[PDB]
Nucleic acid binder design. Structure first.
Ligand SMILES: [Cl-]
Ligand SMILES: [Cl-]
Ligand SMILES: [Mn+2]
Ligand SMILES: [Mn+2]
Length: 191
DNA sequence: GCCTTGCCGGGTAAGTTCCGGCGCG
DNA sequence: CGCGCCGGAACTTACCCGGCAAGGC
């Protein structure tokens, strides 16, 4: 499914560089936000926003995509109870992702929280349970990896992908045409 | 000879929840 | 009155990045 793949990709970005927020305001007012932030304006507008917009249209979500410029980064934001729960329930059921969704999610998580040099293959996150799920998926895909506490200070774990399986990881996972290619993977393929 | 990877410090790119406003039953 | 989109941004915790050296083949 094209929509489930894009969805899993976006969830990867949300988990890695954004979030899902249920806000309560003065006067019993409220808001539900789907958020992805990124320093690069181009990435948010040229790569991420069009995918989100496709999803919004497919799901008949009436809300608009907002791009807010902040001091340190751009924010892509959709204010939508419907889209919020769509992603929050998907995240709840993450262990049940099929292979396609797994790969889309890993791509997204990597763009957001991965080692972009690709000299080493690493993903940082404070959620060990999350990295452990990804570890299992990678193993099933034949990509060896380890999880260690990379930063004792702030308690951020790292998922290190064995360079023995660099080709398999990059070609089979980052470069799968089953769903949107991460920018650096698209570049490699077009050379 | 060199690759790999745990480990750790460097200079910062994300995240999180406020605010005032509007719309609508 | 009770909720849910919009637009902005202040505030908080950094961001992944990259060097080093131990191990192992
Ligand atoms: Cl990438
Ligand atoms: Cl509304
Ligand atoms: Mn990021
Ligand atoms: Mn953070």
């Amino acid at each position: 499914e094209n929509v489930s793949g894009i969805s899993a990709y976006l969830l990867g970005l949300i988990i890695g560089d954004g979030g899902l927020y249920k806000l309560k305001y003065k006067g019993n007012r409220s808001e539900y936000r789907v958020v992805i932030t990124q320093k690069s304006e181009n990435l948010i507008k040229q790569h991420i926003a069009p995918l989100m917009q496709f999803l919004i249209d497919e799901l008949n979500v009436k809300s608009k995509i907002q791009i807010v410029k902040g001091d340190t980064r751009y924010e892509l934001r959709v204010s939508s109870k419907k889209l919020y729960y769509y992603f929050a329930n998907m995240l709840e059921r993450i262990r049940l992702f099929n292979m396609r969704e797994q790969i889309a999610f890993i791509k997204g998580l990597y763009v957001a929280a991965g080692d972009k040099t690709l000299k080493r293959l690493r993903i940082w996150n404070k959620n060990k349970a999350l990295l452990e799920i990804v570890s299992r998926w990678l193993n099933n895909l034949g990509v060896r990896n380890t999880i260690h506490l990379d930063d004792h200070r702030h308690g951020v774990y790292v998922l290190n992908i064995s360079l023995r399986d660099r080709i398999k990881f990059v070609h089979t996972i980052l470069s799968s045409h089953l769903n949107p290619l991460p920018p650096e993977a698209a570049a490699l393929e077009h050379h």
